[PDB]
Design a protein around this nucleic acid. Sequence first.
RNA 1: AAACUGCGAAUGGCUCAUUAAAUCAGUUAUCGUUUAUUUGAUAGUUACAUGGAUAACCGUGGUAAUUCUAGAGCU
RNA 2: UCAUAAUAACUUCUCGAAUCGCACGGCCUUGCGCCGGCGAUGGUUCAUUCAAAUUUCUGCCCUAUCAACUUUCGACGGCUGGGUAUUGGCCAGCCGUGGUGACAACGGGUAACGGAGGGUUAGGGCUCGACCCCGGAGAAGGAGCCUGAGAAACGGCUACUACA
Lengths: 68, 180, 261, 52, 150
Amino acid sequence: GGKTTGFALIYDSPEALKKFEPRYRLVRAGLAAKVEKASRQQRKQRKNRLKTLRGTAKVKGAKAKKEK
Amino acid sequence: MKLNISHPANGSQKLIEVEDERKLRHFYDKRMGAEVAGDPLGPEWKGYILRITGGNDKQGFPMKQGVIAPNRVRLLLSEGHSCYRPRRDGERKRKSVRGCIVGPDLSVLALSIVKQGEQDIPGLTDVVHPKRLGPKRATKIRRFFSLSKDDDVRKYVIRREVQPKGEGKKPYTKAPRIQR
Amino acid sequence: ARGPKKHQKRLSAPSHWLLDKLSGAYAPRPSTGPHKLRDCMPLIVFVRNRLKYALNYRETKAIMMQRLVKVDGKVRTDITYPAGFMDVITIEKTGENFRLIYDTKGRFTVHRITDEEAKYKLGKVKRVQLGRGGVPFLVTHDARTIRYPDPLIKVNDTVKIDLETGKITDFIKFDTGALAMITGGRNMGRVGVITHRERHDGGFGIVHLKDALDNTFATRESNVFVIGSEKPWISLPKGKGVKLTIAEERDQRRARALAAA
Amino acid sequence: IVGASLEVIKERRSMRPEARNAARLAAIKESKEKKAAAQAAKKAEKAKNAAA
Amino acid sequence: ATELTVQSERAFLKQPHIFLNSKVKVKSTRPGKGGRRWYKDVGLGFKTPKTAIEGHYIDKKCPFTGMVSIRGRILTGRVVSTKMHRTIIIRREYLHYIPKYNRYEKRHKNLAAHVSPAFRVEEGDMVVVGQCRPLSKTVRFNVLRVLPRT
RNA sequence: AAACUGCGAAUGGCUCAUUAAAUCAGUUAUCGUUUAUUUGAUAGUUACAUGGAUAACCGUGGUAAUUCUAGAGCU
RNA sequence: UCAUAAUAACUUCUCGAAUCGCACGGCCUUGCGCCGGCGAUGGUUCAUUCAAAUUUCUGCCCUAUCAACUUUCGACGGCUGGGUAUUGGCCAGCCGUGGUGACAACGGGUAACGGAGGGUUAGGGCUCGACCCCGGAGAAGGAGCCUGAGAAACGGCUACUACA
Ligand SMILES: [Mg+2]
Ligand SMILES: [Mg+2]
Ligand SMILES: [Mg+2]
Ligand SMILES: [Mg+2]
Ligand SMILES: [Mg+2]
Ligand SMILES: [Mg+2]
Ligand SMILES: [Mg+2]
Ligand SMILES: [Mg+2]
Ligand SMILES: [Mg+2]
Ligand SMILES: [Mg+2]
Ligand SMILES: [Mg+2]
Ligand SMILES: [Mg+2]
Ligand SMILES: [Mg+2]
Ligand SMILES: [Mg+2]
Ligand SMILES: [Mg+2]
Ligand SMILES: [Mg+2]
Ligand SMILES: [Mg+2]
Ligand SMILES: [Mg+2]
Ligand SMILES: [Mg+2]
Ligand SMILES: [Mg+2]
């Protein structure tokens, strides 16, 4: 046929739209940019790797000098 | 067999290498937490008395106060014991610790200075290190400076200075947010 | 089984919620509160599935965080809050008030009420006795306890609640000739007048009612809820709970359809 | 302590009571005049705003 | 029932919280208040027998002058064994229906109940029992009424 | 950020080895008991504010080896 | 012998707020004085909610080449206690001799988790159900325990056996 059916939302102000709309819809319209992230497994693998360090896990190279 | 010597008064620590056994003979058969004289270590140690605090075995196990044995024993360490850090509420784990009787088997001793001698140590007692933090509670601030009941404890807190990374601006001051 | 449950499986939820068997595997699992789990009205089901104000689960909690919706004059902020019989739901921003009441088919329906009527409630009394210090008190069907009540009030009666100060203002005795609405059983939602009551020592007494159209039915005492003597105090929904048979419903359906169009 | 060298601590603990007494009197009046200034500023401003 | 003596045991048998040594004497109609024997009424149209109120026996499991409440089912049966001490066995008979063959068959069950010294029970008599809390390994009912003999 | 403290981790998901009045089904009882959380009520017998510890952090180490840990100094 | 109240006493003995965030206000003896709003987090008892543990009645497949069974060291009941969140032969002492069975007990088989239900149909039936919903049990085989409102927990700990 030549008929099409969908859904529509009309917002009071442009600022009210960005407050309630989901992010993925914003990317479709081009208002907002996409989020850059790593894969789901790489994020999970990194999370479990940091469970073996206690305190100031950002830099842990101090243990390289123990062997001399 | 290394020695770890610490100076609580000056807040300084040092590590020395000792290879001659007859100097270490007087340390043997002593218990953890006892008093010993440092004279056999050398002429520079005259007038010094030291306190035995702990040590490590050759395999790496630490000494535990309260167990009388020259060898090492397996124990069921609960929460609150010395060489155990539980990972879960109510957890109990069986571990192995080395006794509190000093012997030739251990690899490192830990000991501290109780009484200063006439001579100085080249790298231990000739330098001092400052404290890190001042008091934060309200009553402790008053006692430290011997203030009266109403002396505006706000004004007497210790404040240091810090500056940004490379902004070129002036440094500012930091304060501890008095509690109680 | 090693503790209490926290999940509700779809296809096991109460039937009167009218939930589709597809589109997911779980159900809202109403939280603990003043009303029983079997017969309650979770707020998310009311807002999203009946009023259709919120599209999905994510936006249902967005409304609640703004404290827009309140029940019995006090704002509630959890989506799975168990509402029940006689509760008053007020949304000030849109400007209407709701009362939760059964229809003739045994399920909750939307029912507009005026602002003047949305400031009082009524509930069945559960027990009367002396508390700590000798102070008398009673508890209603929605876990409201009130001290210093009228000594004439006994169990199984109903009391009008101010809902602003929580004080009893008038009451109705439980006796023959009263007007009552059923809350449980197969005769759920019917409205009738108590004809007479028969009691059995050892529990489970029964009462006989009579409909407006001279129909007759019976129910256990635990399912009868007095709402008035004559001219019921609350505003009844459309149909007044008369329970037309299946023959009349299709007769009425086509008569209404052809008359309008 | 790192914040104050040893000369600072004993200087502050051994300050004579006369200096401390002056500090209390200087501070107590500073707040009093500060409080009074805010009290008069608000009461007069509301009068002219109401009039015009 | 036939009991030779009331105090024939290691300890002293008495109803709890019934004070018996008072200097002043006061006469009251109430059962437990004045210091005389205590008893209650079970209900459900069950009348306290005369032997209970005026008897001297001590029993902590009797529905009358005891610490047991009766609630639940009420059943009937015929006694088949009376050879224990204050305990009897009753026999209940019924008919089970087999659907395929469209007819019934006989079945029976055995029940254990506690009998109070107020009643006198013989073999082959019909009794009425009421449910109570567990009093033993296999005793959960209490005798209430003894039907008259033919 | 880190670390102390509070809460959760006893729900979910998987499987059918054991089990023949046992599990289980419909129907009763708790006047024979425990109950975090939610909801509603409810407690008149130096004070303008009490006392000692500990982690993160700084610094000195051990063991081939693990989400192992020692002794010293602040709050 | 309930709710609740009163009296004589008792206790390594409790609880009755030394906690936190927004607003910037009002009195006159103007003292760095007094009073005052709404929330968060806690707290003793009763009620409620999600429950949980025990408990009444009736109902399960084949087998007699299974006919008598249960009490050494509780098997059925009485009494005084001990223990448990509580009842109870659940356990300790003392005293009686009972309890189930041809209306099929007791024992052996099950290529047996139970139920809602699936397949096949004149009616009556025969057969299957590990499996999306509800209840129970288990985490290689056995036992023991810590924390907690809730576990005899195993993506928690201790020991032996078997693997590694
Ligand atoms: Mg009842
Ligand atoms: Mg919580
Ligand atoms: Mg927990
Ligand atoms: Mg589960
Ligand atoms: Mg699978
Ligand atoms: Mg509360
Ligand atoms: Mg009482
Ligand atoms: Mg007993
Ligand atoms: Mg026989
Ligand atoms: Mg089967
Ligand atoms: Mg099997
Ligand atoms: Mg199955
Ligand atoms: Mg199988
Ligand atoms: Mg399949
Ligand atoms: Mg396996
Ligand atoms: Mg907890
Ligand atoms: Mg398990
Ligand atoms: Mg296990
Ligand atoms: Mg696993
Ligand atoms: Mg698990």
